[PDB]
């Protein structure tokens, strides 16, 4: 439907997040990042960049643009992109949950593939696989399968 129980992961108000968040450490963000006025100001810039007319190959450009425009260290953006399986849509969801919950990476968030999530996918255990498909869905599941038979 138009509705999704994933909305609660996107719905986070950036005005309730004190800036800079405690989780936003110098080893993940450049000095420019700490000069955004609010969490909303950063979010609005992140949305602006992410919405660029990129082509699937141009991950190297996006990582550079995220570094220059939003002050996210290149290696952290690459780390994020790998865990999102390239889904630029779930990029604003990553930071809102990372900042609200003060955990990096956010553990139980649909679309944010943890290390333990990948270890569960590696095993052919139907119990672990049910828990994964209940977290991310069959769509993200087949996308993650397609992703690692390559990576």
């Amino acid at each position: 439907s138009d509705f999704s129980n994933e909305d609660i992961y996107d719905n986070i108000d950036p005005d309730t997040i004190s800036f800079p968040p405690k989780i936003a450490t110098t080893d993940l963000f450049l000095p420019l990042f700490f000069h955004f006025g609010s969490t909303r100001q950063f979010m609005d810039k992140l949305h602006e960049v992410i919405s660029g007319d990129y082509e699937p190959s141009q991950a190297e450009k996006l990582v550079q643009d995220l570094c220059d425009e939003t002050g996210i260290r290149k290696n952290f953006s690459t780390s994020i992109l790998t865990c999102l399986s390239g889904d630029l849509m779930v990029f604003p969801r990553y930071f809102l949950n990372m900042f609200k919950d003060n955990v990096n990476p956010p553990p139980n968030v649909p679309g944010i593939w943890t290390h333990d999530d990948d270890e569960s996918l590696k095993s052919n255990d139907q119990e672990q696989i049910r828990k994964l498909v209940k977290k991310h869905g069959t769509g993200r599941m087949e996308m993650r399968k397609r992703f690692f038979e390559k990576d």
């Binding site: 992410i50 919405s51 007319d53 990129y54 082509e55 699937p56 190959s57 141009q58 991950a59 190297e60 996006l62 990582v63 690459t78 992109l81 790998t82 399986s85 390239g86 889904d87 630029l88 849509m89 390559k150 990576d151």
Partner: peptide, 13 residues
């Protein structure tokens, strides 16, 4: 450079 070449983006509508 290695990961980024193989990594495919899912752009916005």
């Amino acid at each position: 450079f290695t990961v980024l070449r193989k990594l495919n983006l899912v752009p916005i509508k």
